[PDB]
Design a protein around this ligand. Structure first.
Ligand SMILES: *[C@@H]1O[C@H](CO[C@@H]2O[C@@H](C)[C@@H](O)[C@@H](O)[C@@H]2O)[C@@H](O[C@@H]2O[C@H](CO)[C@@H](O[C@H]3O[C@H](CO)[C@@H](O)[C@H](O)[C@@H]3O)[C@H](O)[C@H]2NC(C)=O)[C@H](O)[C@H]1NC(C)=O
Ligand code: CLR
Ligand code: NAG
Ligand code: CL
Ligand code: CL
Length: 152
């Protein structure tokens, strides 16, 4: 079935547990690139937010595997994405719909969250999604809305 990590729509980071924070790493999103067998190749696009010099758009690739109805998302990250952004080889899928995905850290006990949404919800997340995020995630920090990340 359809789950956002293996679908073609772009996902934008809407929130995360505070412990995950990386200074000057903004406008985080992942685009769908292609698929080979059960592995979907996505890009991780981010902007190096200096104040100043001018902002630097960066892109690294990674692959994901999802067995149908599995609670786990397999992630095969590149060395750059892995070492620089801390991408883990597995994430726990808490819940999702076509327009959102809530992932947790599998190995950590105080399991860090990352909340992802499709373009319609960057300015405002639905009360239901927001309530789930704030209930089950430790130190929930929303990503603030910034028109420079998606001029439109
Ligand atoms: C996303 O959810 C945030 C968390 O909501 C809280 O936790 C949920 C699990 C649920 O229990 C819900 O009922 C809780 O409110 C939202 O943050 C909360 O927003 C409140 C805004 O009214 C805030 O309060 C403020 O306002 C009162 C006046 O009515 C003041 O007296 C008070 O000092 C506050 O300023 C509340 O404290 C806050 N809670 C937390 C834990 O941060 C958030 O708004 C929501 N966002 C969206 C996009 O819906
Ligand atoms: C979205 C799906 C398909 C999988 C994404 C997997 C990887 C690439 C994701 C999962 C959790 C993500 C991290 C979550 C939180 C933060 C803190 C923020 O301040 C900078 C980005 C950063 C560091 C993210 C980088 C990318 C990340 C490691
Ligand atoms: C597409 O897949 C190829 C190999 O299958 C890979 O090199 C590339 O990163 C993917 N993305 C695009 C858009 O080329
Ligand atoms: Cl600024
Ligand atoms: Cl709503």
């Amino acid at each position: 079935p359809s789950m956002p990590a293996i679908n073609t729509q772009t996902l934008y980071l809407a929130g995360h547990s505070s412990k995950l924070f990386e200074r000057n790493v903004g406008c985080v999103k992942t685009r769908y690139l292609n698929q080979t067998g059960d592995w979907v190749t996505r890009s991780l696009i981010y902007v190096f937010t200096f104040d100043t010099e001018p902002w630097v758009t960066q892109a690294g690739a990674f692959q994901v595997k999802w067995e149908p109805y599995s609670p786990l998302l397999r992630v095969k990250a590149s060395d750059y994405v892995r070492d620089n952004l801390g991408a883990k080889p597995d994430y726990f899928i808490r819940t999702y719909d076509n327009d959102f995905l809530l992932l947790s850290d599998l190995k950590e006990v105080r399991s860090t969250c990352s909340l992802w949404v499709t373009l319609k919800y960057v300015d405002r997340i639905p009360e239901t999604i927001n309530r789930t995020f704030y209930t089950i995630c430790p130190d929930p920090v929303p990503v603030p809305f910034d028109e420079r990340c998606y001029p439109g």
